[PDB]
Structure 1
Amino acid sequence: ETLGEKWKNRLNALGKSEFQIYKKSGIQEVDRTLAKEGIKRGETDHHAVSRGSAKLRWFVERNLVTPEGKVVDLGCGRGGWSYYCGGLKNVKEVKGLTKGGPGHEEPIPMSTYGWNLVRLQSGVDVFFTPPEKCDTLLCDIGESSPNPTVEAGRTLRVLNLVENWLNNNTQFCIKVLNPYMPSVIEKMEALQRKYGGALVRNPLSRNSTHEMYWVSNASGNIVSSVNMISRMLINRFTMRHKKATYEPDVDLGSGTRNIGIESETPNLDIIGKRIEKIKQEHETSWHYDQDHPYKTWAYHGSYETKQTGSASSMVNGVVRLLTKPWDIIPMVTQMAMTDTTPFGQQRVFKEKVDTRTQEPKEGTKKLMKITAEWLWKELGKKKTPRMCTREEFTRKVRSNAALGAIFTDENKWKSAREAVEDSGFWELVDKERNLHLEGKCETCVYNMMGKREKKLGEFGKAKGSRAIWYMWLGARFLEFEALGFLNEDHWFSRENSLSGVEGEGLHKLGYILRDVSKKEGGAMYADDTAGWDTRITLEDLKNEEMVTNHMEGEHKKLAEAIFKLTYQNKVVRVQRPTPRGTVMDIISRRDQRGSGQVVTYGLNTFTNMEAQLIRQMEGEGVFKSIQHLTVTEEIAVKNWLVRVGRERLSRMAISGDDCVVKPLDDRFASALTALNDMGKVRKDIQQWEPSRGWNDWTQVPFCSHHFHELIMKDGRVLVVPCRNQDELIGRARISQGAGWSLRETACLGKSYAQMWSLMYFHRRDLRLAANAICSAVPSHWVPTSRTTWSIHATHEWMTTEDMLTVWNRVWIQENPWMEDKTPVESWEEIPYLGKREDQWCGSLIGLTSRATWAKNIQTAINQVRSLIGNEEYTDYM
């Protein structure tokens, strides 16, 4: 055997104290006495995540390897190497992969210099990933083991994995585990002959390992280097113990880095006045930034502001101390708090908003044009457009109705109600209306904010990581005046349009689904779309603008001005952390969907209906090619619409972007050409993989609900909504931020503790949890607060009388599908959701979990209710 084997055997034959003292016998260390506790406090700059950053700095400083262009990282883990590389000058993009899981290193987020170029991926195995184009490859995978043969096998496997990715002109820095046996030297010789390099040891590396690294800009011999390293290791344990040479840690600073590519052009003639006014308002601190991280948006400037927002969110204390056994479920605690600091907003904006789509072809354009024209002619058969006034808006604002996301212009007034009565507000509104009537806009800007930036929260909060657009009050009033009739007249009701479900309560969609599933055809398909709000192109906006053909006069002029100057020409402010403090930038864009909530809902419903109709057109085989549409097809496609067009719209149900379709023939799943061409890419499925259908209507997900069916004691049959109990409990423990008191939080708790008694009465673990809240609140208080479900325009559980009469009125008297009208007079005749199904849906009954759901029951809940304090109440259980 070689000298390395002797050294390994000698190190194996050693004592514990001798082994501990042998580790530091001349090596160099870095003082981590600051960075660790800085990271623990929550710092996100001027720090190094791990120790490999110093080693990589040592390698780069002596230009042993010079990364450039795109850099691929294997087994990054926390990602010290990738984070250090991102701050370099010649690096344009960093991509890294690691294998996560139990007992493995995981990436954590930092905001160091150039943090907007680094993307890390987790839970991917490198051995089963096809190679891609790369310019510099880094590999630092290796695990020690007492046996030499297993280490040699691991090294050979690593080399076999790595040999495929390398090209002729790619830089590399690869770690080799055990280099002192011929079983690796024979391969190393061929590899060095083919590609070049050498084996060099890092002085920072510990004294307990024989590690070596393979680099690019070096040369020499392998066996001689290994022998000399072994000789040095042998000689090492012969001198005295020398103190470790301490070296200060690396500091990286903070900021954002720009790549330098732009793919957008501005229209100065439309937004010049707005830009000039905004610049003139803040002339004192106006400056140009050269490090804007925007690629598909324009840039104009930046000024100074004060930081707003805070990580995490307030927690409703009234609902807490009642749901005691739920403090240990990871889902409840994780989704409870989100991030809305400028760092989180920048992260969301980089991750989702900044994208780019592609233009469709001629045939799809003609198809959607024809379909949109026919649909607009069909809907407006029994309705006429009109114009809104000021009294209706005043009544809307006075009643605290479901207004959209809007800031109340806090600089001068304090709330919308306080500003409505004033006259200066109306004077400004009139001036802006006069300006808009001549095809100019001057005070129409937006605001942006982010939310939902945790790991498990996005899987249980509708669609997470969203972005809401605020607007000034005057623009809101102008938009309402222009296009209020689409919602004030119920254009998208089920009676008028045979597909929409607007105006229908949450307790009625199950009946609609059951009625739909009674037809003849194939199976039910419930595919969805990811990021629907960002997949809208200019062509769709132009198609939706075709509603003005039914208008006239001043109404038509105002609608045209609103459509042209606002919806497809936007100006948006956003915040961004900088070393000098906090700043606000202004950007612009043509595409995408930004408007009020109700208008967005209506337009999305219309576009979804048109897209579903086009896909059903393609499924039936009316037309064959989408690249170009010819004659004898336009006539054929128009005949299909006239003949059975109305009936085919009755097979669907489209609330927002959620759709359910029952086609005549199962050829629906194989028609994925027009849908992919338009830009509505599906979610979590392969691009060309056929979709999966359902043969049962009790499992189809619609509006994040699965609809069961129940049987009363008498024999009557109902249909009830359902959901995962964990999500409801997690939502129920979050205060929206309208508290800072006990009365407010108690009112909110009582307000949305009645939704469970109304809709989710069929499950054991939720009906009981509402009686405690009703018996703890002192009653006599109005439970007025917006809870959730802004789309559902019922909000019926806000009343004050006893819930039994309300239940009897809602589920019996006003039920079209219920024949008999004999009411009930007790809470004991209402049945439950079985026993096993309750556990499956997420309850805590029937098994060992009943042993911990044994103190949150009437056995030990009376003390919990009394724990509230001097605040009186009234028993109800």
Structure 2
Amino acid sequence: NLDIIGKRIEKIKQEHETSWHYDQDHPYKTWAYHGSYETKSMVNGVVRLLTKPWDIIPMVTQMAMTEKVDTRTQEPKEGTKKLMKITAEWLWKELGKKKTPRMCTREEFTRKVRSNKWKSAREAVEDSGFWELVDKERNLHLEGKCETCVYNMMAIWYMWLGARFLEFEALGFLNEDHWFSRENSLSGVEGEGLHKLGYILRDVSKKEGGAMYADDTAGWDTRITLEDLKNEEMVTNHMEGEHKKLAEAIFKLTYQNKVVRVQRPTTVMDIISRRDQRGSGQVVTYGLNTFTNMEAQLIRQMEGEGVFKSIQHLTVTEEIAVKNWLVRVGRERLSRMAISGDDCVVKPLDDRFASALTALNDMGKVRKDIQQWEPSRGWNDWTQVPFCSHHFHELIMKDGRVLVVPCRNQDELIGRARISQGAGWSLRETACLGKSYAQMWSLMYFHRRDLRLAANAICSAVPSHWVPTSATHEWMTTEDMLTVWNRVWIQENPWMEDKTPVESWEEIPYLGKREDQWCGSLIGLTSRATWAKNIQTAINQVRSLIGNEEYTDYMPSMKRFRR
């Protein structure tokens, strides 16, 4: 502990030697406090002016206004611990069968920062001194020591660009080489895209079994145990030479021991430490969350099938039974799930899964909004299952071909598009962000009447050649959106046997009007009728603010506006 954290703490203490104050009123129970020192969402106007009816919907307007991290998870039982290690060992082998671990490069890192001591990260990557500091820490990590890998809590834990690269170097391959691809993981959806998730849930529904279960975990990142962090580290058993040592060092020194700087208003910076819970880059968090969630859900499926009786201790024959289950049905059982970090849908063999709660509760993966020992409520219809903040409609085109389309409450979609992240945005930057939302809506949400109309209005109000700005983001392009639609929904869609291109937006269907209203459409209101009727006047208001640019009228892509 202090041997691994001291240097990091020793170092911060000196840079603030004229402030070190061991505040005795520190609020930390579960975090080890080490000392203190002295320290100190905007509305997108283009989207809002073209969505006026929503100016009076509180669910939209409130979205733009405005003691769980300090908890302690218990050590699981011996039987639980054995089930986790055996499952983790087998899972890493399976993920590894068709992938080779490998180091990610300065080059790869240098490129990303350029596609989004030093002001920005863009500058540091172009300074040799930064890489020299990286070299110093890198050689420190080969030595089994750490000086500069310190979390900054804000719950999103920032590190300085150097520590990020060393994380990326060692573990980037998990994301960069698609370890949690459905093809490689069977349960995963990494890189799948929102136009694929519905087809994937429908494929799970086709399996023989019971209800579909979609239990959310109450603060997944705070329930990651030291035993979880150790089972994740076993990916290093698949590595070699330098890589193996670098990966080991990130797991030992930054994940399984942590130093964090936090702002407290009583304003001081508190330097706290702990060994458990999740703390990594958002992208390594995603991959290790998916891995550990895959492991927890295979084990819950084991308990429902009665592969083991007691979590208190596992017999020698029970280890044989668990190992044999994995070898004979593990792959089939993985296929019965869709897992995206802390998010899952499971279609188990039968409904015994609903009351199989002992291992799940003992791993610390306690379900949200349900009593600890109350059986899970399953879904009977795949089109009602929540996954990745969506539900999925089955939608038949005039020509009989089947679209499985993503959906959510339309107030959420309009409230998000009306928000920009940051300040110093030009009108052109603001317009280009509005266009990114409009093109997403045309590609993913075309079946919502209000969104197809608002999307066409925004793309009409923003100069035709201005480039949109901000899994798979096909709407980030200047190509014609009907051509992108055809590629995404027809040409590249493995669930579509007939590849006949669509020739206009009118061949592309909407939900039923009642279904559209159920999911938050304002179709049928007076406010929405006036907006639709007078849309060219809203389009002209925004054109006049942006100025004398080249614009396209997209509204005649819709029949009601086609004269």
Same topology, TM > 0.5: yes
3-state SS of the aligned residue for 1:299? strand
Displaced runs of 4 or more, over 6 A? none
Native 8 Å contact 2:337 2:345 kept in 1: yes
The CA deviation at 1:622 is 2.1
Change in Cα spacing, 1:808 to 1:301, as seen in structure 2 (3 Å) is same
- Is 1:772–1:865's contact at 8 Å kept on the other side of the alignment? no
C-alpha separation in 2, matches of 1:495 and 1:861:
45
Q: Assess, with a 3 A threshold, how the Cα gap between structure 1 residues 875 and 849 changes in structure 2: closer, same or farther.
A: closer
**Residues 284-333 of structure 1: CA deviation (Å, up to 9, x unaligned):** 23323222212111222222222xxxxxx322222222222212211112
- Give distance in 1, aligned partners of 2:390 and 2:496: 22
Residues 130-176 of structure 1: CA distance to partner in whole angstroms, max 9, x if unpaired? xxxxxxxxxxxxxxxxxxxxxxxxxxxxxxxxxxxxxxxxxxxxxxx
Structure 1 Cα separation of the partners of residues 110 and 536 of structure 2: 49
Unaligned runs of 5+ in 2: 555-563
CA deviation after TM superposition for structure 1 residue 847, in Å: 5.0
Pair 1:646–1:851, CA change in 2 (3 A): closer
- The question of 1:566 aligning with 2:300 is answered no
Structure 1 residue runs of 5 or longer lacking an equivalent are 1-266, 307-312, 340-351, 400-410, 450-466, 786-792
* Superposition deviation, residue 390 in structure 1: 2.2
Matched residue of 1:864: which SS? helix
- 3-state SS of paired residue (1:710): strand
Map 1:699-738 → 2, pairs under 5 A: 699-738=384-423
1:440 — aligned with what? 145
Deviation at 1:484, TM superposition (A): 2.1
User: Does the CA-based 8 Å contact 1:514-1:697 persist in structure 2?
Assistant: yes
In 1: Cα distance, 2:527 partner to 2:299 partner: 50
- Please tell me whether the aligned partners of residues 182 and 190 of structure 2 are also in contact (alpha carbons under 8 angstroms): yes
Contact 2:432 2:469 in 1 (8 A): yes
Aligned 8 A contact 2:457 2:535 in 1: no
Instruction: Please give the alpha-carbon distance, in whole angstroms, between the structure 2 residues aligned to 1:437 and 1:322.
Output: 56
Kindly report the root-mean-square deviation, in angstroms, between the aligned alpha carbons of the 2 structures. Answer: 2.2
Matches for 1:194-273 after TM superposition, within 5 Å: 267-273=1-7
1:867 Cα deviation from its structure 2 partner = 6.2
SS of residue in 2 equivalent to 1:300? strand
Deviation at 1:861, TM superposition (A): 6.1
Contact 1:573 1:586 in 2 (8 A): yes
User: Quick one: which of 109, 121, 129 aligns to 1:424?
Assistant: 129
1:362 shift after superposition:
1.0
How many angstroms apart in 1 are the aligned matches of 2:252 and 2:538? 64
* Mapped contact 2:453–2:532 kept (Cα < 8 A): no
1: CA distance between counterparts of 2:477 and 2:7? 49
- Quick one: structure 1 residues 538 and 864, their matched pair in 2 at CA, closer, same or farther if it must change by over 3 Å? closer
Question: Contact between 1:296 and 1:354, CA under 8 Å: does it hold in 2?
Answer: yes
* 1:191-218 deviation digits (Å, cap 9, x = unpaired): xxxxxxxxxxxxxxxxxxxxxxxxxxxx
Deviation at 1:489, TM superposition (A): 1.9
Conserved 8 A contact 2:80-2:363: yes
Q: Distance in 2 between matches of 1:314 and 1:647?
A: 47
Offset at residue 714 of structure 1 (A):
1.6
Which has the higher relative contact order, 1 or 2, with Cα contacts under 8 A spaced 6 or more apart?
Answer: 2
Contact 2:29 2:70 in 1 (8 A): yes
Shift of 1:530: 1.1
Is the 8 Å Cα contact of residues 187 and 334 (structure 2) preserved in structure 1?
A: yes
Contact kept, 8 Å, 1:738 with 1:744, in 2: the verdict is no
Alpha-carbon distance, 1:638 to partner: 2.3
Instruction: Select which of 39, 49, 58 maps to 1:330.
Output: 58
- Taking the aligned partners of 1:647 and 1:286, their CA distance within structure 2 comes to 57
My pick for the range that moved more, 330-339 or 621-630, is 330-339
Q: Does the 8 A contact of 1:325 with 1:856 survive in 2? A: no
1:387 partner SS? coil
Q: How does 1:758-837 map to 2 (within 5 A)?
A: 758-785=443-470, 793-837=471-515
Change (3 A) 1:638 1:836: same
Contact residue 301 and residue 585 of structure 1 kept, 8 A: yes
The 1:811/1:607 distance shift into structure 2, 3 A limit, reads same
Matched pairs, number: 554
1:336-374 deviation line (CA, Å, top 9, x unaligned):
1239xxxxxxxxxxxx21111112111111111111112
Preserved CA contact (<8 Å) 2:460 2:539: no
The verdict on how the C-alpha distance between 1:432 and 1:825 changes in structure 2, with shifts beyond 3 A counting, is: same
The answer to whether the 8 Å contact 1:324/1:856 transfers is no
Which structure dedicates a bigger proportion of its chain to helix?
2
Among 177, 186, 206, the alignment partner of 1:498 is 186
* CA distance in 2: counterparts of 1:809 and 1:366, whole angstroms: 47
Query: What is the alpha-carbon distance in structure 1 between the residues aligned to residue 78 and residue 147 of structure 2?
Result: 36
Q: 1:301 to 1:738 in 2, by over 3 A?
A: same
In 1, distance between residues paired with 2:132 and 2:109? 16
| Contact 1:855-1:861 at 8 Å conserved across structures | no
In the aligned structure 1, how far is the partner of 2:90 from the partner of 2:365?
22
Deviation for aligned residue 1:553: 2.1
- When residues 739 and 316 of structure 1 are mapped into structure 2, their CA distance, relative to the original with a 3 A threshold, is farther
Residue in structure 2 matching 1:843, options 521, 535, 555: 521
Distance 2:26 2:417 in 1: 39
Aligned match of 1:220: none
Q: Per-residue deviation at 1:631?
A: 3.0
Question: Deviation digits for residues 681-735 of structure 1, max 9, x if unmatched?
Answer: 1111122211111221111111111110111112211111111110111111111
Contact 1:323 1:856 in 2 (8 A): no
Residue 264 of structure 2 aligns to a residue in which SS?
A: strand
**Which structure has the larger Rg over C-alpha atoms?**
1
State yes or no: 1:609 paired with 2:260.
Answer: no
Shift of 1:862: 5.0
* Cα 1:871/1:314, change in 2 over 3 Å: farther
Deviations 1:558-614 (A, max 9, x none): 221221011111111111213xxx222211111100001221111111101111111
Query: For each residue in 1:90-117, what CA deviation from the matched residue of structure 2 results, as whole angstroms up to 9, or x when unmatched?
Result: xxxxxxxxxxxxxxxxxxxxxxxxxxxx
Preserved contact between residue 658 and residue 703 of structure 1 (Cα < 8 Å): yes
SS in 1 for 2:111: helix
Partner of 1:353: 69
Give the C-alpha shift of residue 383 in structure 1. Answer: 2.2
| Distance verdict in 2 for CA 1:741–1:627, change over 3 Å | same
Q: Per-residue displacement from partner, 1:847-870 (whole Å, max 9, x unpaired)?
A: 566566577645876557556666
Q: Residue in 2 aligned with 1:193?
A: none
Change (3 A) 1:667 1:867: same
- Tell me, yes or no, if the aligned pair for 2:218 and 2:367 is still in contact at 8 Å: yes
Calculate percent identity across the aligned residue pairs: 100
Distance 1:573 1:362 in 2: 34
Match of 1:397 among 101, 104, 113: 113
Write out aligned runs for 1:50-449 (5 A). 267-306=1-40, 313-338=41-66, 352-399=68-115, 412-449=117-154
Work out which of the residue numbers 537, 548, 553 in structure 2 matches 1:870: 548
Q: TM-score, normalised by structure 1?
A: 0.61
